[PDB]
Design a binder for this molecule. Sequence first.
Ligand SMILES: [Mg+2]
Ligand SMILES: [Mg+2]
Ligand SMILES: [Mg+2]
Ligand SMILES: [Mg+2]
Ligand SMILES: [Mg+2]
Ligand SMILES: [Mg+2]
Ligand SMILES: [Mg+2]
Ligand SMILES: [Mg+2]
Ligand SMILES: [Mg+2]
Ligand SMILES: [Mg+2]
Ligand SMILES: [Mg+2]
Ligand SMILES: [Mg+2]
Ligand SMILES: [Mg+2]
Ligand SMILES: [Mg+2]
Ligand SMILES: [Mg+2]
Ligand SMILES: [Mg+2]
Ligand SMILES: [Mg+2]
Ligand SMILES: [Mg+2]
Ligand SMILES: [Mg+2]
Ligand SMILES: [Mg+2]
Ligand SMILES: [Mg+2]
Ligand SMILES: [Mg+2]
Ligand SMILES: [Mg+2]
Ligand SMILES: [Mg+2]
Ligand SMILES: [Mg+2]
Ligand SMILES: [Mg+2]
Ligand SMILES: [Mg+2]
Ligand SMILES: [Mg+2]
Ligand SMILES: [Mg+2]
Ligand SMILES: [Mg+2]
Ligand SMILES: [Mg+2]
Ligand SMILES: [Mg+2]
Ligand SMILES: [Mg+2]
Ligand SMILES: [Mg+2]
Ligand SMILES: [Zn+2]
Lengths: 37, 126, 60, 176, 136, 192
Amino acid sequence: MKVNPSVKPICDKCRVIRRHGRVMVICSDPRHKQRQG
Amino acid sequence: MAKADKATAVADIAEQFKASTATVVTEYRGLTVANLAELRRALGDSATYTVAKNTLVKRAASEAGIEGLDELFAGPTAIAFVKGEAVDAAKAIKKFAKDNKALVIKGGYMDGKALSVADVEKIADL
Amino acid sequence: NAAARANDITYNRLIQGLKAAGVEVDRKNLAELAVSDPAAFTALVDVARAALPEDVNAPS
Amino acid sequence: SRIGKQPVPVPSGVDVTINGQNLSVKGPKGTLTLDVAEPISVSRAEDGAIVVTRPDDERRSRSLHGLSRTLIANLVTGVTEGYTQKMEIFGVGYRVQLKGQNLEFALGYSHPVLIEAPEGITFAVESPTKFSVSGIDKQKVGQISAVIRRLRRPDPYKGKGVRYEGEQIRRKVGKT
Amino acid sequence: MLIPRKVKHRKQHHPEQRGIASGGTSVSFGDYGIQALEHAYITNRQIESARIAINRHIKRGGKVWINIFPDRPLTKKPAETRMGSGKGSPEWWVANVKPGRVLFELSYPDEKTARDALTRAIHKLPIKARIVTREE
Amino acid sequence: TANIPNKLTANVRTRTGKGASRQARRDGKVPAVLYGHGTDPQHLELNARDFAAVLRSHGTNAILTLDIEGTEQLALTKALDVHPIRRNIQHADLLVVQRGEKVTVEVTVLVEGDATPGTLVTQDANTIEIEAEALSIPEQLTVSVEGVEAGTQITAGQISLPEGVNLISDPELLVVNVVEAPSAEALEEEGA
RNA sequence: GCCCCUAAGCGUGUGCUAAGUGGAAAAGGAUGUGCAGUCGCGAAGACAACCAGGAGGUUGGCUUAGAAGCAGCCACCCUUGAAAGAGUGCGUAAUAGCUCACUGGUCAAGUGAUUGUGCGCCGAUAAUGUAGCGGGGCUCAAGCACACCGCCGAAGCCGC
RNA sequence: ACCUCGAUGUCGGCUCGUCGCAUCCUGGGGCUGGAGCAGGUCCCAAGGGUUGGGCUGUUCGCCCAUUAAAGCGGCACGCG
Ligand SMILES: [Mg+2]
Ligand SMILES: [Mg+2]
Ligand SMILES: [Mg+2]
Ligand SMILES: [Mg+2]
Ligand SMILES: [Mg+2]
Ligand SMILES: [Mg+2]
Ligand SMILES: [Mg+2]
Ligand SMILES: [Mg+2]
Ligand SMILES: [Mg+2]
Ligand SMILES: [Mg+2]
Ligand SMILES: [Mg+2]
Ligand SMILES: [Mg+2]
Ligand SMILES: [Mg+2]
Ligand SMILES: [Mg+2]
Ligand SMILES: [Mg+2]
Ligand SMILES: [Mg+2]
Ligand SMILES: [Mg+2]
Ligand SMILES: [Mg+2]
Ligand SMILES: [Mg+2]
Ligand SMILES: [Mg+2]
Ligand SMILES: [Mg+2]
Ligand SMILES: [Mg+2]
Ligand SMILES: [Mg+2]
Ligand SMILES: [Mg+2]
Ligand SMILES: [Mg+2]
Ligand SMILES: [Mg+2]
Ligand SMILES: [Mg+2]
Ligand SMILES: [Mg+2]
Ligand SMILES: [Mg+2]
Ligand SMILES: [Mg+2]
Ligand SMILES: [Mg+2]
Ligand SMILES: [Mg+2]
Ligand SMILES: [Mg+2]
Ligand SMILES: [Mg+2]
Ligand SMILES: [Zn+2]
């Protein structure tokens, strides 16, 4: 969980979604999953 | 590709079909590029082997009475033109299909009528 | 405002209609009447609605 | 929305009853009920199709149209045929077995693990290494699948734990 | 580390920073440039870091133009000193930038890494800025 | 080299001044002035969106037709102002030009090609002044370099030009410069 | 200022807001949402998905113990052609494999990108007790944007 | 230098606590260059606890021996 205000689609496959007003990026690559907070 | 590209592809197929004696459409599905190249080299003495968009060939088919084969393009379709005689490429395709087990002959065109796979086999035997 | 809302009209509309009708009676006498004669308010609200224009949101 | 434009086919051996906003499905495998969102309406086409309609082109209608269509399609297809999810228990000293309606897992813990089976779900064991679950509701089937899967923490080194049929976990090793 | 060789007077009042930049509003030395948006004090160390960033990414080809020069000085007294008793010594030289002024200019073939390097420079400046091309 | 005119509609200004001009700008219309050798300057309003679209389509310099209460005018976009921040249009100068006249035109130039490993690309001059006919104005100029080595200074006068165009700029102007590729030592030495 | 504490519109017409934003704040980040202006492709079938193809010179040279499309450096050439990119990567010492790029089959119209915009979300963590709308409460705005009609409102003005 | 010079008593120690969380442990999670233990880092979390001594007036700090830790700060540098 790399918690940082700026989140980007690091690889070509990381995907950004929206949850409870917090947008977080999810990828099958484990570290590519983070939240912005 | 562009609209001009589609138009020139249709045109090129038109002169190719007009200058060819007969045509056959087969299924390239499940055929490795290696054996496809081998088949092309084997049939390159007389015939030619290419592929094209089903809808593009459908539009190109309105010029002649080959409109009856439009129902046969449902599924992968590879079109071959027999510039020299008729039976050589048909027999080559038949033996390739029976050897590889993954190629299916959809049908062929000859004498102005659309004929089924059994008739393809019969004329290739002839 | 209490009396106007009892008679089914707002204070601002009642005052504007009263001014349009040109009645110069003051809030002292209106309040004493509200304590006193609902007949007087019935007549007054009738006059106010009669003097009220057709559309309140006209650009005029 | 785009899928919602496509009506849901209804098989012959399925009975559907609708009363206002509540909807129910009658079939050989059982009965199920759901309630749909207020702003949108659903209708029964006379040719054996499910028609769902949204009143406007706004956000809520656009979203809920496809939700309703796919939920009804899943409901009717599960009620007619059904749903099976099978698991594989890979590892050493890992034992699974079924008694009655309950399930017992020997997952290496010092104490045995027992899970109570909810209503409307069935379990069947084929091998002590892999079993399957059968049911009618995708909700309950997925709930059980997740509950079973969360017994064991992820193991990216040795593959210890539980997983589905096609689930793949990446392999990684340490030199030390 | 852009510092003027010599200045006639070594201390200057607080500069005015009002209005919209008139000079150097359009980019013409190369093809691509960066235009600022807000009022700011841009320092020589910031210019050095931005130029290092631009070259550090553009590598072999291309070259850089800089349309500003940090020659305005600023003073600062050291801490633990009562205020007054004269002016402090000048510490860093700054270049006052007005909105819309062109900061850096680039001339490299391809849009991809051209915009990439310009953004690399953008991320090191303290104020908002945008890419601008030679075409109006 | 032949071009086609661009059609647009325009209206004459009602009020003149900073307030009226800024009100029109807030509305979404750009004020413009039409003056020329006809000894009859005019001030008009244009559509910002259509003007920007035409500018994007036909570059900085295009030949334009003006519709003033149904009247047809032939004019050239010669000078203009652009906002430093909003990158919008605030003023443009339109010069009436008839067919068969000599005008001074500034045109942008582009450079393309493949460079050798020891070649550094440099472009000092990007706009040159060319005298040509109104309907023969080119939109862009291209130059090609292939296998350039050492000193290969490209001269503006050396650029090939179409027929009917005159080079107002002196031949001493240089447009493209090719020198040896830089080194880390020189890069770290410069600026210190 | 006009929902109540408190006097006046739980006023009218047209739009935005889901955050109690309104009712503390930045760099920066995001398939939040509304408007306007574009271009590419799209009934000659787009975009996504779901079967197949994705090799022969070819292990391209230097470098290395090692370099085979995937430490690194140079053309980044070429053939069957539908398309092979000196390969975007997660793969092995190095091979070999999983792939992918462009392309071909079914379905059947929107699919992308920057552009200027009004609101928004995160970025947000201090000490006695809410404590950053005055409070209750307010989106079934009592918030914001634009017009219209009115009212309350001082010792200001007018009347005696 | 805005309140206090017709008076706001000052550092440390003893007793006595209180509050915030930027958390020392205990509690729950994400990732690893986390074979296992043993780790590193980030998030949520203030319920509870948070050594005794030698030295110096000390605060601080060094050293001696454990425990889960021997928290950071605010409260007129808490409190005559
Ligand atoms: Mg000047
Ligand atoms: Mg900045
Ligand atoms: Mg009060
Ligand atoms: Mg009241
Ligand atoms: Mg209302
Ligand atoms: Mg109002
Ligand atoms: Mg409205
Ligand atoms: Mg919030
Ligand atoms: Mg606020
Ligand atoms: Mg903000
Ligand atoms: Mg940004
Ligand atoms: Mg492929
Ligand atoms: Mg080669
Ligand atoms: Mg290499
Ligand atoms: Mg936009
Ligand atoms: Mg309030
Ligand atoms: Mg009044
Ligand atoms: Mg008074
Ligand atoms: Mg007076
Ligand atoms: Mg003082
Ligand atoms: Mg005082
Ligand atoms: Mg005293
Ligand atoms: Mg005291
Ligand atoms: Mg003291
Ligand atoms: Mg915390
Ligand atoms: Mg823990
Ligand atoms: Mg860690
Ligand atoms: Mg805590
Ligand atoms: Mg407690
Ligand atoms: Mg002691
Ligand atoms: Mg305290
Ligand atoms: Mg004290
Ligand atoms: Mg204390
Ligand atoms: Mg204290
Ligand atoms: Zn990823």
